[PDB]
Ligand binder design. Sequence first.
Ligand SMILES: C[n+]1ccccc1CC(P(=O)(O)O)P(=O)(O)O
Ligand SMILES: C[n+]1ccccc1CC(P(=O)(O)O)P(=O)(O)O
Ligand SMILES: [Mg+2]
Ligand SMILES: [Mg+2]
Ligand SMILES: [Mg+2]
Ligand SMILES: [Mg+2]
Ligand SMILES: [Mg+2]
Ligand SMILES: [Mg+2]
Lengths: 341, 338
Amino acid sequence: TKKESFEDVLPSILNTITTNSELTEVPEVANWLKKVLEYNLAGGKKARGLTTLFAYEMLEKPENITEETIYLAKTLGWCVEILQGFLVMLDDIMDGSTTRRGVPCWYQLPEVGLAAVNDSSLMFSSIFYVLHAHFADKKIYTNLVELFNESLMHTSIGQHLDVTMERRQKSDYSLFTIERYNAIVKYKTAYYTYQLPVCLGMLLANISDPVLHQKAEDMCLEIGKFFQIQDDYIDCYGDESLTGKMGTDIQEAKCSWLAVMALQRCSASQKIVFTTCYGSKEPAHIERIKELYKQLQLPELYAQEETRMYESLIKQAHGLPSELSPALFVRLIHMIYKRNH
Amino acid sequence: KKESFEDVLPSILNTITTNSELTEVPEVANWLKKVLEYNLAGGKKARGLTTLFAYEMLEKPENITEETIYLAKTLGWCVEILQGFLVMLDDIMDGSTTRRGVPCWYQLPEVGLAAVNDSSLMFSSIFYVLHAHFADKKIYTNLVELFNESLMHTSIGQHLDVTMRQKSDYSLFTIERYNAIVKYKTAYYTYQLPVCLGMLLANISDPVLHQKAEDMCLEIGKFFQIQDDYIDCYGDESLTGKMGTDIQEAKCSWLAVMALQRCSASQKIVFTTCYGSKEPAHIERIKELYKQLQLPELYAQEETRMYESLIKQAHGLPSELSPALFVRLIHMIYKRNH
Ligand SMILES: C[n+]1ccccc1CC(P(=O)(O)O)P(=O)(O)O
Ligand SMILES: C[n+]1ccccc1CC(P(=O)(O)O)P(=O)(O)O
Ligand SMILES: [Mg+2]
Ligand SMILES: [Mg+2]
Ligand SMILES: [Mg+2]
Ligand SMILES: [Mg+2]
Ligand SMILES: [Mg+2]
Ligand SMILES: [Mg+2]
């Protein structure tokens, strides 16, 4: 399969990081960074990295694809995976998370703690060594480096919206609106999850036309909103043995799609239960919220909205220029529709 | 000069917004302006000025224009942003309370550990400034690469710095370890970076000169970090702006390494009992040990020996690397008390 093929190159990417940097001189740090990367990249679906590789393979003329260009698309894909790993190492700290991919979050390890914040910077910085090593002499080099930095700025914009202590003052959830939700997910998720891997595919395929990049970006941003609404649903309703992570959105008072929809439907008395119980680590409080979500029929709303959005994305994908491969986008939509993790 | 450097700041902040997606999200643009203002306020602007001075003394006077001076200040602000980012994170790891005479950013109630996100906003800002001013210039990729390399070097050194003695085993507190720490965590971003940026703006690319410059910068950076270590213990908080934590954080500081060189058998046990403890009496007992081992007198003398060695190296540089620039830099820090 495509996944083992993508994973096959990981040991070689690790060596590239070392050999191309000052890590060559400090084996204590080179060895530590290997541990960091293996732990934080292990398991999961590799969906960002696959999306990059799939995009390239679907967008380039089959006659232009070589073994070297496939290794390059995998490498770009792995740079997205490393970005993700960096993003989630910090997210876990900010979200008060305990587990991810079925083991303790990196920062929760006793040998690590708050020094995770330095491990994140070691990870992020790795990306640029990979990009320089492979692409410094190519015309697309500056586009790649700029794209990765823009992805960091976008994501951190959205993280700010997400975690800001401003978003709620005690019983004031007046900012829990769809306008706020749409901004949060656009920036924190949709850029790095879809726009970045698709654009990397397009660049590698020598597609440069600004109009095609804008159309692809618009499609990506719609798919990423969809993807995050699923993430938010899974936080509450997912089976930990499948997701690998204990959900914290309720305890952390997040402006999740479920919270926004619950406020749409609360009676006056239900809004008081929401405001009393949301944002608390007491187990009776968390359960009261979950009960409320059930009473409000949010599971049924989710199933229907997942389908409506699915049908809308599929139509959008069908209306793209053939140069953007409607089939790529249909297949990306399909791969996530009805996921349970 | 410093105020002519500080005058450029409002245009930098304005570029950060307009050159990015921040224009669509005023909540975040406004926040980032606060982040930048608080974390860049005051201090000496030393790394920024190094960048400017390096360009002004390396470039031929006939080639400096009002426009290349503005660009040099712009790159110096990017170094100040980098330093802001680095110390934001460092203050989290070191358990610090104050910097520049106010609470460290992560210590603010509305920030906390979300300071890790504010750090990413700052880092990322750098690249928008570089794009705005340099995107169409030949040196653009070199500039973008130097900032990325500075992150990697710094983080390498920070790893060695923060990584988890074992109890009373101080066998790794050696000069070899110390030298590696301070090369990577300090010397690259504090001197090599700003000097390299000046060299690039002045169109100096010869790799032998980049090497000689780098070697000088690394020696100055070690020196600078020994002074930093000394100030952690002995500096006056009302001048430094910061409460020291090296003792309670069990750091492999210059002072600790030197204390180990001097300790009697019994002093060693005092050291291993009391170092790395937040208890005030334990901290004061380490300071009393440092005094008894004559570390203040040794620092005074070593500072002077190192200064003399630095000046002899600077005088020996090629003319095209400006011995005067290096003499000037060394004089700006010798005998500093903050
Ligand atoms: C989806 N995402 C985007 C940006 C940063 C972190 C993540 C991770 C998720 P996750 O903790 O559920 O994996 P979020 O905290 O719910 O948004
Ligand atoms: C000097 N430096 C280098 C890299 C990262 C942070 C610093 C800040 C210093 P500071 O906290 O004394 O200002 P260090 O923690 O003693 O090393
Ligand atoms: Mg999370
Ligand atoms: Mg989060
Ligand atoms: Mg989630
Ligand atoms: Mg510190
Ligand atoms: Mg430190
Ligand atoms: Mg210090």
